[PDB]
Design a protein around this ligand. Structure first.
Ligand code: ZZA
Length: 167
C-alpha cells in the first residue's frame, strides 16, 4: 500500500490522475518526483519551471552546481538530485523536445530511467511545451516502465482524452 489517492488504474503498474504535479508532490511527499528536464537543467517553464518555483529556486541552485561539475545531461538521460520540499529525490529526466528537432525514438530511452525507481510521481515525458503527442507518450510509458508510476496530467481536457482513448 502507498499514499497516492484518486488515481485511475490503467495497467498493473501505471496509474493516472488529473492533478497539478506540484500540489500532488506537496501533499504526498513521494520518494521520487520526476522533472521534465532539459539537458542544461534550466528550469524555466512547463513542469520544470513550476517545480522549481515551488522550491523557491533551490532546485535551480542545486542544478547549476550539478551542471558546473558534470556538464549537460544526454537527451534520454537523467540524474537524481534533491526533492527539496516536494519529495525525497527528484529524478530529472530529459525527454526529446520535438520543438528542437530531437528523435522521438529517444522517448523510450527517457522512460527507461523510471525503471531504476520502485515508485514515482511523474508527468508525461515530452508532453506540454516539449511538443510530443501526449497519447503517444502515455503508450510509450505503459510499454516501457515496469515500476509503479503515478502520472499527473495538469489539463483536465487532456486527462479525459488520454483515459477515453487508452487501449
Ligand atoms: O496537463 C498536462 O500535464 C499536459 C501535458 N501535455 N499537455 C499538452 C498541452 C497542450 C498541448 C499538448 C500537450 C498538457
Amino acid at each position: 500500500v502507498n499514499s497516492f489517492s484518486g488515481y485511475l488504474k490503467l495497467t498493473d503498474n501505471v496509474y493516472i490522475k488529473n492533478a497539478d504535479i506540484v500540489e500532488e508532490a506537496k501533499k504526498v511527499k513521494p520518494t521520487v518526483v520526476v522533472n521534465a528536464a532539459n539537458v542544461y537543467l534550466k528550469h524555466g517553464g512547463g513542469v520544470a519551471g513550476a517545480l522549481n518555483k515551488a522550491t523557491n529556486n533551490a532546485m535551480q541552485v542545486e542544478s547549476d552546481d550539478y551542471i558546473a561539475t558534470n556538464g549537460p545531461l544526454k537527451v534520454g538521460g537523467s540524474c537524481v538530485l534533491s526533492g527539496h520540499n516536494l519529495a525525497k529525490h527528484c529524478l530529472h529526466v530529459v525527454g526529446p523536445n520535438v520543438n528542437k528537432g530531437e528523435d522521438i525514438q529517444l522517448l523510450k530511452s527517457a522512460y527507461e530511467n523510471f525503471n531504476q525507481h520502485e515508485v514515482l510521481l511523474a508527468p508525461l515525458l515530452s508532453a506540454g511545451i516539449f511538443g510530443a503527442d501526449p497519447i503517444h507518450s502515455l503508450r510509450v510509458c505503459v510499454d516501457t516502465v515496469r515500476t509503479n508510476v503515478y502520472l499527473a496530467v495538469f489539463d483536465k481536457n487532456l486527462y479525459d482524452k488520454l483515459v477515453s482513448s487508452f487501449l
